[PDB]
Protein backbone atom coordinates (compact mmCIF):
# COMPACT_ATOMS: atom_id res chain seq x y z
CA UNK A 1 0.00 0.00 0.00
CA UNK A 2 2.84 2.41 0.77
CA UNK A 3 4.52 1.72 -2.58
CA UNK A 4 1.25 2.35 -4.41
CA UNK A 5 0.68 5.57 -2.46
CA UNK A 6 4.17 6.78 -3.37
CA UNK A 7 3.38 5.92 -6.99
CA UNK A 8 0.11 7.85 -6.83
CA UNK A 9 1.79 10.97 -5.47
CA UNK A 10 4.66 10.68 -7.98
CA UNK A 11 2.25 10.35 -10.90
CA UNK A 12 0.21 13.29 -9.58
CA UNK A 13 3.38 15.40 -9.56
CA UNK A 14 4.31 14.17 -13.03
CA UNK A 15 0.83 14.97 -14.38
CA UNK A 16 1.06 18.50 -12.99
CA UNK A 17 4.56 19.00 -14.42
CA UNK A 18 3.51 17.69 -17.83
CA UNK A 19 0.53 20.05 -17.62
CA UNK A 20 2.69 23.12 -17.12
CA UNK A 21 5.09 21.81 -19.78
CA UNK A 22 2.21 21.42 -22.24
CA UNK A 23 1.18 24.99 -21.47
CA UNK A 24 4.69 26.36 -22.08
CA UNK A 25 4.95 24.34 -25.29
CA UNK A 26 1.62 25.65 -26.58
CA UNK A 27 2.73 29.23 -25.89
CA UNK A 28 6.07 28.78 -27.67
CA UNK A 29 4.30 27.10 -30.60
CA UNK A 30 1.77 29.91 -31.03
CA UNK A 31 4.65 32.38 -31.03
CA UNK A 32 6.53 30.34 -33.63
CA UNK A 33 3.42 30.09 -35.81
CA UNK A 34 2.77 33.83 -35.76
CA UNK A 35 6.44 34.52 -36.50
CA UNK A 36 6.41 32.03 -39.37
CA UNK A 37 3.27 33.57 -40.92
CA UNK A 38 4.69 37.08 -40.52
CA UNK A 39 8.05 36.22 -42.07
CA UNK A 40 6.42 34.35 -44.95
CA UNK A 41 4.06 37.18 -45.88
CA UNK A 42 6.77 39.82 -45.45
CA UNK A 43 9.02 37.85 -47.80
CA UNK A 44 6.23 37.44 -50.37
CA UNK A 45 5.35 41.14 -50.31
CA UNK A 46 9.04 42.11 -50.44
CA UNK A 47 9.45 40.07 -53.62
CA UNK A 48 6.26 41.48 -55.15
CA UNK A 49 7.26 45.08 -54.41
CA UNK A 50 10.73 44.34 -55.80
CA UNK A 51 9.13 43.28 -59.09
Amino acid sequence: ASELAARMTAMSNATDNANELKKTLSINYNRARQAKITGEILEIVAGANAC
Partner: protein, 502 residues
Protein backbone atom coordinates in the same frame (compact mmCIF):
# COMPACT_ATOMS: atom_id res chain seq x y z
CA UNK B 1 9.67 56.03 -60.79
CA UNK B 2 7.94 56.83 -64.09
CA UNK B 3 5.03 58.58 -62.33
CA UNK B 4 4.91 61.39 -59.78
CA UNK B 5 2.15 63.05 -57.75
CA UNK B 6 2.28 66.54 -59.30
CA UNK B 7 2.20 64.74 -62.67
CA UNK B 8 -1.43 65.94 -62.85
CA UNK B 9 -2.26 68.04 -65.88
CA UNK B 10 -3.27 71.39 -64.38
CA UNK B 11 0.14 71.97 -62.78
CA UNK B 12 1.87 71.29 -66.09
CA UNK B 13 -0.61 73.60 -67.82
CA UNK B 14 0.29 76.35 -65.35
CA UNK B 15 3.99 75.69 -65.90
CA UNK B 16 3.67 75.86 -69.69
CA UNK B 17 1.68 79.09 -69.30
CA UNK B 18 4.83 80.87 -68.13
CA UNK B 19 8.27 79.28 -67.93
CA UNK B 20 10.59 81.88 -66.39
CA UNK B 21 9.11 84.27 -63.82
CA UNK B 22 9.81 85.68 -60.36
CA UNK B 23 7.50 84.46 -57.58
CA UNK B 24 6.48 80.88 -56.76
CA UNK B 25 3.73 79.51 -54.51
CA UNK B 26 5.43 80.38 -51.24
CA UNK B 27 2.98 79.68 -48.40
CA UNK B 28 0.21 78.48 -50.72
CA UNK B 29 0.01 74.77 -51.42
CA UNK B 30 -2.73 73.01 -53.37
CA UNK B 31 -3.46 69.56 -52.01
CA UNK B 32 -3.48 66.54 -54.29
CA UNK B 33 -3.52 62.79 -53.70
CA UNK B 34 -5.24 62.63 -50.33
CA UNK B 35 -4.33 59.08 -49.35
CA UNK B 36 -4.17 57.07 -46.10
CA UNK B 37 -3.11 59.45 -43.35
CA UNK B 38 -0.91 61.27 -45.89
CA UNK B 39 -1.48 64.06 -48.40
CA UNK B 40 1.02 64.93 -51.13
CA UNK B 41 0.72 68.71 -51.34
CA UNK B 42 2.07 70.55 -54.35
CA UNK B 43 3.46 73.91 -53.35
CA UNK B 44 4.76 75.10 -49.99
CA UNK B 45 8.17 75.85 -51.43
CA UNK B 46 9.58 77.52 -48.31
CA UNK B 47 8.12 74.92 -45.93
CA UNK B 48 10.22 73.33 -43.19
CA UNK B 49 10.31 69.73 -42.08
CA UNK B 50 8.12 69.46 -39.01
CA UNK B 51 6.01 72.41 -40.14
CA UNK B 52 2.42 72.67 -39.02
CA UNK B 53 0.22 73.10 -42.09
CA UNK B 54 -3.44 74.05 -41.95
CA UNK B 55 -5.97 72.62 -44.38
CA UNK B 56 -9.15 74.20 -45.70
CA UNK B 57 -11.32 71.72 -43.79
CA UNK B 58 -9.52 72.64 -40.57
CA UNK B 59 -7.26 69.64 -40.19
CA UNK B 60 -3.72 70.20 -38.94
CA UNK B 61 -0.79 68.51 -40.63
CA UNK B 62 2.95 68.11 -40.21
CA UNK B 63 5.30 68.46 -43.17
CA UNK B 64 7.13 65.13 -43.06
CA UNK B 65 8.32 64.24 -46.57
CA UNK B 66 9.74 67.29 -48.35
CA UNK B 67 10.23 65.85 -51.82
CA UNK B 68 11.48 67.81 -54.81
CA UNK B 69 8.19 69.12 -56.24
CA UNK B 70 5.61 68.02 -53.65
CA UNK B 71 5.64 68.04 -49.86
CA UNK B 72 3.92 65.07 -48.25
CA UNK B 73 2.20 65.75 -44.96
CA UNK B 74 0.60 63.59 -42.27
CA UNK B 75 -2.99 64.25 -41.27
CA UNK B 76 -3.68 64.94 -37.59
CA UNK B 77 -7.26 63.73 -37.79
CA UNK B 78 -9.87 62.10 -39.94
CA UNK B 79 -9.08 64.24 -42.96
CA UNK B 80 -12.20 63.13 -44.81
CA UNK B 81 -13.45 66.48 -46.11
CA UNK B 82 -10.02 67.45 -47.48
CA UNK B 83 -11.19 68.23 -51.02
CA UNK B 84 -8.59 67.46 -53.68
CA UNK B 85 -7.11 70.57 -55.26
CA UNK B 86 -7.79 72.72 -52.19
CA UNK B 87 -5.46 75.18 -50.53
CA UNK B 88 -3.02 74.46 -47.70
CA UNK B 89 -1.40 77.13 -45.53
CA UNK B 90 1.93 76.92 -43.72
CA UNK B 91 2.06 78.40 -40.24
CA UNK B 92 5.81 79.03 -39.94
CA UNK B 93 5.74 77.27 -36.56
CA UNK B 94 7.42 73.92 -36.08
CA UNK B 95 5.16 71.43 -34.29
CA UNK B 96 4.43 72.78 -30.80
CA UNK B 97 1.61 73.06 -28.28
CA UNK B 98 0.30 75.88 -26.08
CA UNK B 99 1.60 75.22 -22.57
CA UNK B 100 0.61 76.97 -19.35
CA UNK B 101 -0.53 76.38 -15.80
CA UNK B 102 -4.16 76.60 -16.96
CA UNK B 103 -4.03 72.96 -18.10
CA UNK B 104 -4.12 71.54 -14.56
CA UNK B 105 -7.53 69.92 -14.30
CA UNK B 106 -8.48 69.57 -17.98
CA UNK B 107 -8.77 66.78 -20.54
CA UNK B 108 -6.80 67.10 -23.77
CA UNK B 109 -6.87 65.35 -27.16
CA UNK B 110 -3.19 65.04 -28.20
CA UNK B 111 -3.49 68.47 -29.84
CA UNK B 112 -3.81 70.53 -26.62
CA UNK B 113 -7.44 71.07 -27.58
CA UNK B 114 -9.91 70.38 -24.75
CA UNK B 115 -12.30 67.48 -25.21
CA UNK B 116 -13.36 68.52 -21.73
CA UNK B 117 -16.32 70.71 -22.64
CA UNK B 118 -15.22 73.41 -20.17
CA UNK B 119 -14.02 76.07 -22.59
CA UNK B 120 -10.62 77.13 -23.81
CA UNK B 121 -7.21 77.24 -22.12
CA UNK B 122 -5.17 80.44 -21.97
CA UNK B 123 -1.51 80.11 -22.86
CA UNK B 124 1.87 81.70 -23.53
CA UNK B 125 2.94 79.55 -26.46
CA UNK B 126 6.07 77.40 -26.05
CA UNK B 127 7.16 73.75 -26.02
CA UNK B 128 8.05 72.30 -29.36
CA UNK B 129 6.55 68.81 -29.24
CA UNK B 130 9.78 66.98 -30.06
CA UNK B 131 11.98 68.64 -27.48
CA UNK B 132 15.51 67.33 -26.94
CA UNK B 133 16.24 65.20 -23.90
CA UNK B 134 18.73 66.44 -21.28
CA UNK B 135 22.39 65.66 -21.80
CA UNK B 136 24.87 64.11 -19.40
CA UNK B 137 25.79 67.35 -17.63
CA UNK B 138 22.18 68.50 -17.44
CA UNK B 139 20.81 65.74 -15.21
CA UNK B 140 21.58 64.29 -11.79
CA UNK B 141 21.26 60.99 -9.95
CA UNK B 142 17.88 60.26 -8.37
CA UNK B 143 17.74 60.85 -4.62
CA UNK B 144 14.19 61.37 -3.37
CA UNK B 145 11.32 58.87 -3.19
CA UNK B 146 8.20 59.07 -5.31
CA UNK B 147 5.71 57.27 -3.09
CA UNK B 148 2.98 55.31 -4.86
CA UNK B 149 1.04 54.39 -1.73
CA UNK B 150 1.31 50.67 -2.50
CA UNK B 151 3.23 48.83 0.21
CA UNK B 152 4.78 46.28 -2.15
CA UNK B 153 6.05 48.91 -4.60
CA UNK B 154 7.33 51.29 -1.94
CA UNK B 155 9.03 48.47 -0.04
CA UNK B 156 10.58 46.27 -2.74
CA UNK B 157 10.41 48.22 -6.01
CA UNK B 158 11.12 51.75 -4.74
CA UNK B 159 10.82 54.52 -7.31
CA UNK B 160 12.49 57.91 -7.16
CA UNK B 161 11.69 61.19 -8.86
CA UNK B 162 13.38 61.01 -12.24
CA UNK B 163 13.22 57.25 -12.87
CA UNK B 164 11.51 55.50 -15.78
CA UNK B 165 9.76 52.51 -14.21
CA UNK B 166 7.81 50.23 -16.55
CA UNK B 167 4.46 48.68 -15.62
CA UNK B 168 4.32 45.47 -17.64
CA UNK B 169 1.72 42.71 -17.53
CA UNK B 170 -1.16 41.03 -19.29
CA UNK B 171 -4.54 42.55 -19.97
CA UNK B 172 -6.80 43.16 -16.96
CA UNK B 173 -3.97 42.41 -14.53
CA UNK B 174 -3.87 45.90 -13.07
CA UNK B 175 -1.41 48.59 -14.27
CA UNK B 176 -4.14 51.20 -14.48
CA UNK B 177 -5.29 50.62 -10.94
CA UNK B 178 -1.58 50.94 -10.12
CA UNK B 179 -1.13 54.09 -12.23
CA UNK B 180 -4.19 55.72 -10.64
CA UNK B 181 -3.02 54.70 -7.15
CA UNK B 182 0.27 56.48 -7.76
CA UNK B 183 -1.55 59.56 -9.07
CA UNK B 184 -4.07 59.68 -6.20
CA UNK B 185 -1.16 59.34 -3.75
CA UNK B 186 0.33 62.70 -4.83
CA UNK B 187 -2.16 64.82 -2.87
CA UNK B 188 0.27 66.29 -0.34
CA UNK B 189 3.46 66.16 -2.41
CA UNK B 190 4.03 69.01 -4.86
CA UNK B 191 3.92 66.88 -8.01
CA UNK B 192 2.14 67.57 -11.29
CA UNK B 193 0.67 64.40 -12.77
CA UNK B 194 0.17 63.70 -16.46
CA UNK B 195 -1.82 60.70 -17.66
CA UNK B 196 -1.82 59.81 -21.35
CA UNK B 197 -4.44 57.28 -22.44
CA UNK B 198 -3.20 56.23 -25.85
CA UNK B 199 -5.60 53.55 -27.03
CA UNK B 200 -8.05 52.89 -24.22
CA UNK B 201 -11.77 52.65 -24.77
CA UNK B 202 -13.59 55.89 -23.99
CA UNK B 203 -15.43 54.36 -21.03
CA UNK B 204 -12.14 53.48 -19.33
CA UNK B 205 -11.01 57.09 -19.66
CA UNK B 206 -14.40 58.19 -18.32
CA UNK B 207 -13.98 56.00 -15.23
CA UNK B 208 -10.43 57.19 -14.62
CA UNK B 209 -11.28 60.88 -14.98
CA UNK B 210 -14.34 60.62 -12.74
CA UNK B 211 -12.31 58.78 -10.09
CA UNK B 212 -9.70 61.54 -10.31
CA UNK B 213 -12.34 64.28 -10.03
CA UNK B 214 -14.14 62.62 -7.12
CA UNK B 215 -11.01 61.87 -5.10
CA UNK B 216 -9.59 65.34 -5.69
CA UNK B 217 -6.52 64.48 -7.77
CA UNK B 218 -7.57 66.72 -10.66
CA UNK B 219 -6.24 69.98 -9.18
CA UNK B 220 -2.71 68.78 -10.07
CA UNK B 221 -3.45 66.45 -13.02
CA UNK B 222 -3.72 66.88 -16.77
CA UNK B 223 -5.28 64.21 -19.00
CA UNK B 224 -4.32 63.59 -22.63
CA UNK B 225 -6.75 61.09 -24.12
CA UNK B 226 -6.79 59.34 -27.50
CA UNK B 227 -9.57 56.77 -27.61
CA UNK B 228 -9.59 53.55 -29.63
CA UNK B 229 -11.37 55.21 -32.56
CA UNK B 230 -8.84 58.03 -32.80
CA UNK B 231 -6.61 58.30 -35.88
CA UNK B 232 -3.35 56.41 -35.62
CA UNK B 233 -1.46 59.70 -35.93
CA UNK B 234 -3.12 61.07 -32.81
CA UNK B 235 -2.37 57.91 -30.84
CA UNK B 236 1.18 58.14 -32.17
CA UNK B 237 1.51 61.77 -31.04
CA UNK B 238 -0.33 61.80 -27.69
CA UNK B 239 2.60 60.75 -25.43
CA UNK B 240 4.83 63.39 -27.05
CA UNK B 241 2.28 66.09 -26.24
CA UNK B 242 2.05 64.70 -22.71
CA UNK B 243 5.85 64.80 -22.45
CA UNK B 244 5.99 68.40 -23.67
CA UNK B 245 3.26 69.47 -21.24
CA UNK B 246 5.13 67.81 -18.37
CA UNK B 247 8.50 69.20 -19.49
CA UNK B 248 6.94 72.65 -19.22
CA UNK B 249 6.69 72.20 -15.45
CA UNK B 250 9.84 70.08 -15.14
CA UNK B 251 12.02 72.86 -16.54
CA UNK B 252 10.50 75.25 -13.99
CA UNK B 253 11.93 73.56 -10.87
CA UNK B 254 8.72 71.58 -10.28
CA UNK B 255 8.45 67.81 -10.07
CA UNK B 256 6.29 65.96 -12.58
CA UNK B 257 5.00 62.43 -12.92
CA UNK B 258 3.78 61.13 -16.28
CA UNK B 259 1.97 57.90 -17.06
CA UNK B 260 1.72 56.59 -20.63
CA UNK B 261 -1.15 54.13 -20.54
CA UNK B 262 -0.46 51.48 -23.19
CA UNK B 263 2.73 52.69 -24.81
CA UNK B 264 2.49 49.48 -26.85
CA UNK B 265 -0.61 50.99 -28.46
CA UNK B 266 1.51 53.93 -29.61
CA UNK B 267 3.86 51.34 -31.10
CA UNK B 268 0.95 49.67 -32.90
CA UNK B 269 -0.26 53.03 -34.22
CA UNK B 270 3.26 53.75 -35.45
CA UNK B 271 3.34 50.34 -37.14
CA UNK B 272 0.06 51.18 -38.88
CA UNK B 273 1.49 54.54 -39.96
CA UNK B 274 4.66 52.95 -41.34
CA UNK B 275 2.90 50.14 -43.19
CA UNK B 276 0.56 52.68 -44.75
CA UNK B 277 3.62 54.69 -45.78
CA UNK B 278 5.05 51.42 -47.20
CA UNK B 279 8.14 51.28 -45.13
CA UNK B 280 9.91 47.90 -44.98
CA UNK B 281 9.06 46.44 -41.56
CA UNK B 282 11.08 44.23 -39.27
CA UNK B 283 9.92 41.47 -36.94
CA UNK B 284 6.13 41.22 -36.48
CA UNK B 285 5.74 44.01 -39.07
CA UNK B 286 7.17 46.65 -36.74
CA UNK B 287 8.95 49.55 -38.46
CA UNK B 288 12.38 48.97 -36.95
CA UNK B 289 12.37 52.63 -35.89
CA UNK B 290 10.05 51.63 -33.05
CA UNK B 291 12.91 51.52 -30.54
CA UNK B 292 13.73 55.11 -31.47
CA UNK B 293 10.01 55.91 -31.20
CA UNK B 294 10.03 54.81 -27.59
CA UNK B 295 13.54 55.86 -26.55
CA UNK B 296 13.46 59.47 -27.71
CA UNK B 297 10.21 59.73 -25.74
CA UNK B 298 11.44 58.04 -22.57
CA UNK B 299 14.75 59.92 -22.47
CA UNK B 300 12.84 63.10 -21.61
CA UNK B 301 12.04 61.79 -18.10
CA UNK B 302 15.06 63.02 -16.15
CA UNK B 303 16.29 64.44 -12.85
CA UNK B 304 17.89 67.75 -13.74
CA UNK B 305 20.97 69.11 -11.99
CA UNK B 306 20.99 71.94 -9.46
CA UNK B 307 21.79 74.40 -12.25
CA UNK B 308 18.54 73.52 -14.04
CA UNK B 309 16.29 73.96 -11.01
CA UNK B 310 16.40 70.33 -9.81
CA UNK B 311 13.13 69.61 -11.61
CA UNK B 312 12.22 66.02 -12.33
CA UNK B 313 9.99 63.90 -14.54
CA UNK B 314 9.05 60.39 -13.48
CA UNK B 315 7.82 58.14 -16.26
CA UNK B 316 5.54 55.16 -15.63
CA UNK B 317 5.08 53.61 -19.08
CA UNK B 318 2.69 50.69 -19.42
CA UNK B 319 3.22 47.70 -21.71
CA UNK B 320 0.63 44.98 -22.16
CA UNK B 321 2.08 41.56 -22.95
CA UNK B 322 0.48 38.72 -24.89
CA UNK B 323 0.22 35.58 -22.72
CA UNK B 324 2.96 36.99 -20.50
CA UNK B 325 5.47 37.38 -23.34
CA UNK B 326 8.36 39.08 -21.57
CA UNK B 327 10.64 38.30 -24.54
CA UNK B 328 8.44 39.88 -27.22
CA UNK B 329 9.55 42.84 -29.31
CA UNK B 330 7.97 45.92 -27.72
CA UNK B 331 8.27 44.52 -24.15
CA UNK B 332 12.00 43.91 -24.53
CA UNK B 333 12.46 47.29 -26.23
CA UNK B 334 10.80 49.14 -23.36
CA UNK B 335 12.75 47.02 -20.86
CA UNK B 336 16.01 47.96 -22.58
CA UNK B 337 14.97 51.63 -22.47
CA UNK B 338 13.65 52.01 -18.91
CA UNK B 339 15.21 51.75 -15.43
CA UNK B 340 13.42 48.73 -14.03
CA UNK B 341 9.98 47.19 -14.34
CA UNK B 342 7.04 46.05 -12.22
CA UNK B 343 5.67 42.72 -13.35
CA UNK B 344 1.96 42.16 -12.85
CA UNK B 345 0.96 38.52 -13.25
CA UNK B 346 -2.46 37.37 -14.42
CA UNK B 347 -2.08 34.25 -12.27
CA UNK B 348 -1.68 36.08 -8.95
CA UNK B 349 -4.24 38.67 -10.03
CA UNK B 350 -6.93 36.09 -10.74
CA UNK B 351 -5.95 34.01 -7.71
CA UNK B 352 -7.09 36.95 -5.57
CA UNK B 353 -3.67 38.41 -4.76
CA UNK B 354 -4.79 41.60 -6.27
CA UNK B 355 -1.76 43.89 -6.51
CA UNK B 356 -0.15 41.17 -8.56
CA UNK B 357 3.51 42.17 -8.43
CA UNK B 358 5.81 39.35 -9.58
CA UNK B 359 8.52 40.47 -7.16
CA UNK B 360 11.03 37.87 -8.29
CA UNK B 361 11.25 39.30 -11.80
CA UNK B 362 10.67 43.01 -11.08
CA UNK B 363 13.59 45.30 -10.22
CA UNK B 364 14.27 48.96 -9.61
CA UNK B 365 17.76 50.21 -10.37
CA UNK B 366 17.53 53.04 -7.82
CA UNK B 367 16.61 51.15 -4.65
CA UNK B 368 17.99 52.68 -1.47
CA UNK B 369 18.83 55.87 -3.36
CA UNK B 370 15.08 56.41 -3.65
CA UNK B 371 13.96 54.86 -0.36
CA UNK B 372 13.94 56.79 2.92
CA UNK B 373 15.84 55.43 5.91
CA UNK B 374 12.76 54.08 7.70
CA UNK B 375 11.65 52.13 4.65
CA UNK B 376 15.12 50.60 4.18
CA UNK B 377 15.28 49.56 7.84
CA UNK B 378 11.83 48.00 7.81
CA UNK B 379 11.92 46.54 4.28
CA UNK B 380 15.19 44.61 4.56
CA UNK B 381 13.60 41.84 6.64
CA UNK B 382 10.49 42.01 4.45
CA UNK B 383 12.26 41.33 1.17
CA UNK B 384 14.24 38.61 2.97
CA UNK B 385 11.10 36.83 4.20
CA UNK B 386 9.40 37.09 0.81
CA UNK B 387 12.59 35.79 -0.81
CA UNK B 388 12.34 32.74 1.47
CA UNK B 389 8.65 32.26 0.62
CA UNK B 390 9.57 32.45 -3.08
CA UNK B 391 11.44 29.14 -3.06
CA UNK B 392 9.35 27.60 -0.26
CA UNK B 393 5.99 27.84 -2.04
CA UNK B 394 7.23 26.56 -5.40
CA UNK B 395 9.39 23.81 -3.92
CA UNK B 396 7.75 22.33 -0.82
CA UNK B 397 4.22 20.98 -0.81
CA UNK B 398 4.09 20.27 2.92
CA UNK B 399 7.67 21.25 3.93
CA UNK B 400 11.29 20.37 4.26
CA UNK B 401 12.09 20.63 7.97
CA UNK B 402 8.34 20.55 8.65
CA UNK B 403 8.53 22.33 12.01
CA UNK B 404 10.35 25.59 11.24
CA UNK B 405 9.15 25.75 7.64
CA UNK B 406 5.57 25.68 8.92
CA UNK B 407 6.86 28.39 11.25
CA UNK B 408 8.49 30.04 8.22
CA UNK B 409 5.98 29.87 5.38
CA UNK B 410 2.81 30.13 7.48
CA UNK B 411 3.94 32.85 9.88
CA UNK B 412 5.80 34.85 7.24
CA UNK B 413 4.75 34.17 3.67
CA UNK B 414 1.02 33.51 3.78
CA UNK B 415 0.42 36.37 6.23
CA UNK B 416 2.71 38.82 4.45
CA UNK B 417 0.73 38.04 1.31
CA UNK B 418 -2.43 39.29 3.02
CA UNK B 419 -0.33 42.19 4.31
CA UNK B 420 0.67 43.23 0.77
CA UNK B 421 -2.74 43.02 -0.90
CA UNK B 422 -4.42 46.40 -1.06
CA UNK B 423 -7.83 47.56 -2.31
CA UNK B 424 -8.58 49.41 -5.51
CA UNK B 425 -7.87 53.16 -5.38
CA UNK B 426 -6.77 53.23 -1.73
CA UNK B 427 -3.17 54.41 -1.29
CA UNK B 428 -1.28 54.38 2.00
CA UNK B 429 0.88 57.06 3.54
CA UNK B 430 4.53 56.29 4.25
CA UNK B 431 3.96 56.12 8.00
CA UNK B 432 1.23 53.52 7.54
CA UNK B 433 3.48 51.61 5.13
CA UNK B 434 6.43 51.56 7.54
CA UNK B 435 4.13 50.57 10.42
CA UNK B 436 2.45 47.83 8.39
CA UNK B 437 5.74 46.31 7.26
CA UNK B 438 7.13 46.46 10.81
CA UNK B 439 4.05 44.75 12.26
CA UNK B 440 4.51 41.82 9.89
CA UNK B 441 8.13 41.11 9.03
CA UNK B 442 9.60 41.22 12.54
CA UNK B 443 7.40 38.32 13.61
CA UNK B 444 4.56 40.04 15.41
CA UNK B 445 1.78 38.73 13.14
CA UNK B 446 2.56 35.03 13.41
CA UNK B 447 -0.59 33.69 15.09
CA UNK B 448 -3.53 35.67 13.72
CA UNK B 449 -6.36 34.24 11.66
CA UNK B 450 -5.53 34.32 7.97
CA UNK B 451 -8.87 35.99 7.21
CA UNK B 452 -8.38 38.44 10.10
CA UNK B 453 -4.97 39.77 9.03
CA UNK B 454 -6.57 42.44 6.85
CA UNK B 455 -9.00 43.57 9.55
CA UNK B 456 -6.32 43.63 12.25
CA UNK B 457 -4.01 45.65 10.02
CA UNK B 458 -6.54 48.30 9.02
CA UNK B 459 -7.84 48.69 12.58
CA UNK B 460 -4.32 48.96 14.02
CA UNK B 461 -3.61 51.57 11.34
CA UNK B 462 -6.56 53.71 12.47
CA UNK B 463 -5.59 53.15 16.12
CA UNK B 464 -2.03 54.39 15.68
CA UNK B 465 -3.29 57.29 13.56
CA UNK B 466 -5.59 58.17 16.47
CA UNK B 467 -3.66 57.47 19.68
CA UNK B 468 0.00 57.98 18.66
CA UNK B 469 0.42 61.19 16.64
CA UNK B 470 3.98 61.54 17.96
CA UNK B 471 4.89 58.40 16.00
CA UNK B 472 3.73 60.07 12.79
CA UNK B 473 5.55 63.23 13.86
CA UNK B 474 8.85 61.46 14.55
CA UNK B 475 8.53 59.64 11.22
CA UNK B 476 7.59 62.65 9.08
CA UNK B 477 10.29 64.65 10.90
CA UNK B 478 13.49 62.61 10.54
CA UNK B 479 12.28 59.90 8.09
CA UNK B 480 14.12 57.25 10.12
CA UNK B 481 12.94 54.30 12.22
CA UNK B 482 14.25 55.24 15.65
CA UNK B 483 14.08 52.97 18.69
CA UNK B 484 11.61 55.43 20.23
CA UNK B 485 9.04 55.05 17.45
CA UNK B 486 9.89 51.34 17.37
CA UNK B 487 9.13 50.78 21.07
CA UNK B 488 6.02 52.94 21.11
CA UNK B 489 4.70 51.12 18.04
CA UNK B 490 5.41 47.88 19.92
CA UNK B 491 3.26 48.89 22.89
CA UNK B 492 0.68 50.27 20.45
CA UNK B 493 0.37 46.95 18.61
CA UNK B 494 0.19 45.09 21.93
CA UNK B 495 -2.65 47.37 23.04
CA UNK B 496 -4.39 47.00 19.68
CA UNK B 497 -4.07 43.21 19.76
CA UNK B 498 -5.47 42.90 23.28
CA UNK B 499 -8.28 45.23 22.23
CA UNK B 500 -9.05 43.31 19.02
CA UNK B 501 -9.04 39.87 20.65
CA UNK B 502 -12.14 40.63 22.71
Amino acid sequence: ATIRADEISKIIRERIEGYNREVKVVNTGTVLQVGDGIARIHGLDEVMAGELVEFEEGTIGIALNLESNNVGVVLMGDGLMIQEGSSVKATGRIAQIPVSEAYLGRVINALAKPIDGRGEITASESRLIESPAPGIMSRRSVYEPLQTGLIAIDAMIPVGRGQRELIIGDRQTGKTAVATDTILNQQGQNVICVYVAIGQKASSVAQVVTNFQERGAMEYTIVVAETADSPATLQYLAPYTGAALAEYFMYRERHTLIIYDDLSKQAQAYRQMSLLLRRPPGREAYPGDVFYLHSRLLERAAKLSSLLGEGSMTALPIVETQAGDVSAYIPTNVISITDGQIFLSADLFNAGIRPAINVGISVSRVGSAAQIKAMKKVAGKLKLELAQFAELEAFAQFASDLDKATQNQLARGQRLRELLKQPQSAPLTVEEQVMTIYTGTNGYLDSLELDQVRKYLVELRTYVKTNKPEFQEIISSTKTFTEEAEALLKEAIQEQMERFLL
